[PDB]
Design a protein around this nucleic acid. Structure first.
Ligand SMILES: [Mg+2]
Ligand SMILES: [Mg+2]
Ligand SMILES: [Mg+2]
Ligand SMILES: [Mg+2]
Ligand SMILES: [Mg+2]
Ligand SMILES: [Mg+2]
Ligand SMILES: [Mg+2]
Ligand SMILES: [Mg+2]
Ligand SMILES: [Mg+2]
Ligand SMILES: [Mg+2]
Ligand SMILES: [Mg+2]
Ligand SMILES: [Mg+2]
Ligand SMILES: [Mg+2]
Ligand SMILES: [Mg+2]
Ligand SMILES: [Mg+2]
Ligand SMILES: [Mg+2]
Ligand SMILES: [Mg+2]
Ligand SMILES: [Mg+2]
Ligand SMILES: [Mg+2]
Lengths: 57, 93, 82, 136
RNA sequence: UCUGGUGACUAUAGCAAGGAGGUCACACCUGUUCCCAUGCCGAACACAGAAGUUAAGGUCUUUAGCGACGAUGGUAGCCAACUUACGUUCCGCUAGAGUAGAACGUUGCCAGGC
RNA sequence: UUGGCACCUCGAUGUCGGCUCAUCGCAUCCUGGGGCUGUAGUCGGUCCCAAGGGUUGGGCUGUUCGCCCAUUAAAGCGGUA
RNA sequence: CUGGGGCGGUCGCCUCCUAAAAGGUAACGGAGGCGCUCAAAGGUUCCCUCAGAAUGGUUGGAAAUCAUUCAUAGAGUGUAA
RNA sequence: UUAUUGGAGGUAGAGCACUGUUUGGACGAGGCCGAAUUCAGACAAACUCCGAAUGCCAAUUAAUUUAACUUGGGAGUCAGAACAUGGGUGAUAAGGUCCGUGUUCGAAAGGGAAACAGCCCAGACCACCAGCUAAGGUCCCAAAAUAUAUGUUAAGUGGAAAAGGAUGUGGCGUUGCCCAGACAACUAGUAGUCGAGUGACACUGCGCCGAAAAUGUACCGGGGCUAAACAUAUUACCGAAGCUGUGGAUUGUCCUUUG
């Protein structure tokens, strides 16, 4: 019931909505991390800002 | 007379075409005395439905049990590869 | 370097702003404009009165709902209750 | 020289030349058909120049139709003018073929004859073609 | 339950055909002195009436032939990703239109009398 | 070649023909080698491989281009601001 | 204004399309109008339903009146859509 | 921004019921070729009985983060450009012009694309002779595999062009000819004698020709490659001013036991 997110690819050169989602998870620059409780509000966002993030557990 | 299929496990993805490279063809069944079960018959024996009656007729298939007395309802014949995909079945009851 | 033909028309009108001006669900006030058209694409319902062939506007307070009551016609009502 | 009699407005756009064919890709009339497989235009003068070459090899024997009647106009602005004062007048007509739709249907012929005659008119067209016979 | 009056339900309810009756209730007719009136005519509107008639209207029971609604599977398009200058492929979500399986000859509120 | 677009140059990038001098492609004009001819021979048509070398003197107009005279084995087509 | 300029044509309002299923959105892109009219073609209360297609009937436009039947809007709305 | 529900509108697609355009069959409508309708098919920016993906306004909705708005001083811009896609104009011509919508440059240095504002990764506070990794690569110039396994091509294709032409070469499928003995070859004018394959199609990967331009090879960047090329998978390693390790910088928040 936990997920930790990791931003692997960078954020420049991606259109204006996906660059605006990736701070709402709390990531701020590359190779950062944030630990978030599992929630179907969360796991809809990482569907949109997939192909960037590396998740686990 | 000569047909067989597996009950095609549902919610298949859009990788359904890389098994159409092998000579399969998806199909569903209808009918009075049935419920709508997607089947996966291989078209290698569909040079052997012309070889029984032609188009209008009856041939059973046996997806486990209950080999339905069926009839070929419709094609989806897409040319440029000269093949058939998504034929359909219909019981007579 | 040859004299090219004359165009004929150009000449557009200006614009008018049409369409919905409030939306399904929110809270409106008794003078506001719901929808407006050059015809009748949305009939009025209860507590909504027409204008001069335009501007379906709410009579009194409440929230708005869109609704159909025929096979093609559509209407707008406002219920003050909450 | 097949033309439309009446046309609503004489200066129109150009069709979206992508995608598959709409329909009409099953032969209905003849026994033998000729369909296309690449995506060009035909300009209302091929379609008669593929009709006169077709007729004479069969010596006007069996039935032959066409299936592609050109509807759309297309305009070419006159000889070497600068850009922009309005569209030019029409000069021909056109009907866009998608890949995989039938051009010609022939009947009243054996197989070994008509398969020659479709080839001799396939070189009069600016498209790639492929023989076909009544999907059954 | 059934007949009538007024409601809601996207024609699944309607037209198209066919058979059944009575008027305790609608009609059909009997007329125009009056109420009223046809740019004319009491066919219609209204009024005065009840000997006839179920043929018609409306009611009821069958027929899926006319329209209408309509699923599962597909294919085209397509937001996101990848590759590439090809009238492109490939992968991951949503998902029709036509066409077939068919459902369908209405449903239910409240009144007054059986 | 005739154009289309306006990207560099207006605190100047001199513009047509001709003389002087060349240099480079080959889609070859002569010469060298072949196939094929509805090629008797001598001539001739057409096509392939080939740049090594040759490619004229005058009248006319500013001319380019062009026609015309007399020859020659031939009087090639082009790029190089 | 201007695919450099004069030349030709344009200069404000109204309606579509282009315009990419909210609104918006250009070009010397494609099509049309207006610079008013109506004392009733405005307000109200009642009542009626169409152009056509047949079928016959003094006059016959093919069609100017009359009836009958099948007509869901295929007519009409002073003016362009 | 995201899930949930409810909504507005008619594009891509589809379709012919609507105004319009169409080629075929029978259908009537004079005294030897034509005049309404009906069946089977098609077309559309100004044709829609239908009709999605996405975006767009609102939930007094719940999760995560950091904005938003009102007023008052100070401006600068109103010459944009290339890519990726939906379009008009142009000739489905341009490094063209004109709109939508994104990115980057402008105003951004580094690494790759041989060099190269606009493409591909990624955002530089400064130091160090420290480690992992992205895009592209791994015989030499030049850091890293002459890695592993299956195949393919024999042209320098890789390392710039189509219509067409063709017993090139592979894995694929169907079918008719068959020790009764063909298809190669002999001798007859009825056709005999020779002992292992032959034709048609059907779909595909990789090739060849078609292929001519101007100082000098002349689009591999060069050397050079028959694997150092293409396809298919699996493994490490190099690879930036990215991220970490570490030293001190200036400002802000929070502890504030002033670290
Ligand atoms: Mg009477
Ligand atoms: Mg030039
Ligand atoms: Mg410009
Ligand atoms: Mg200056
Ligand atoms: Mg100077
Ligand atoms: Mg000077
Ligand atoms: Mg040569
Ligand atoms: Mg020379
Ligand atoms: Mg002299
Ligand atoms: Mg000008
Ligand atoms: Mg819009
Ligand atoms: Mg379309
Ligand atoms: Mg379009
Ligand atoms: Mg362009
Ligand atoms: Mg732009
Ligand atoms: Mg920036
Ligand atoms: Mg470099
Ligand atoms: Mg070096
Ligand atoms: Mg530090």
């Amino acid at each position: 019931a936990k997920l930790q997110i990791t931003l692997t690819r960078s954020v420049i050169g991606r259109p204006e909505t996906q660059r605006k989602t990736v701070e709402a998870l709390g990531l701020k620059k590359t190779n950062s991390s944030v630990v978030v409780e599992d929630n179907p509000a969360i796991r809809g966002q990482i569907n949109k800002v997939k192909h960037l993030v590396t998740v686990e557990e | 007379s000569l047909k067989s299929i597996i009950r095609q496990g549902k919610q298949t993805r859009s990788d359904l075409k890389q098994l159409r490279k092998s000579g399969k063809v998806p199909a569903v069944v209808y009918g009075y005395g049935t419920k709508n079960v997607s089947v996966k018959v291989d078209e290698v024996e569909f040079i052997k439905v012309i070889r029984e009656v032609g188009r209008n007729g009856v041939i059973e298939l046996g997806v486990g049990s209950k080999t339905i007395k069926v009839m070929v309802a419709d094609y989806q014949f897409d040319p440029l590869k000269n093949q058939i995909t998504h034929i359909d079945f219909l019981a007579i009851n | 370097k040859k004299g090219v033909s004359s165009t004929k028309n150009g000449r557009d009108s200006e614009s008018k702003r049409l369409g919905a001006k409030r939306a399904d669900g929110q809270f409106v006030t008794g003078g506001s404009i719901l929808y407006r058209q050059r015809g009748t694409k949305i009939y009025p319902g209860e507590n909504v009165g027409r204008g001069g062939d335009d501007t379906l506007f709410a009579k009194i307070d409440g929230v708005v709902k869109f609704e159909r009551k025929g096979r093609d016609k559509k209407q707008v009502s406002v219920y003050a209750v909450a | 020289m097949l033309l439309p009699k009446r046309v609503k407005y004489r200066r129109q756009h150009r069709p979206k030349t992508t995608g598959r064919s709409k329909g009409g890709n099953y032969v209905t009339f003849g026994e033998f058909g000729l369909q296309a497989t690449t995506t060009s235009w035909i300009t209302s003068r091929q379609i008669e120049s593929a009709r006169i070459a077709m007729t004479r090899y069969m010596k006007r024997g069996g039935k032959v139709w066409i299936k592609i009647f050109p509807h759309t106009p297309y305009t070419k602005k006159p000889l070497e003018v600068r850009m922009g004062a309005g569209k030019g007048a029409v000069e021909g007509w056109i009907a866009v073929v998608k890949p995989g739709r039938i051009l010609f249907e022939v009947a009243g012929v054996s197989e070994e004859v008509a398969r020659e005659a479709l080839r001799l008119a396939s070189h009069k067209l600016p498209v790639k073609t492929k023989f076909v016979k009544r999907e059954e």
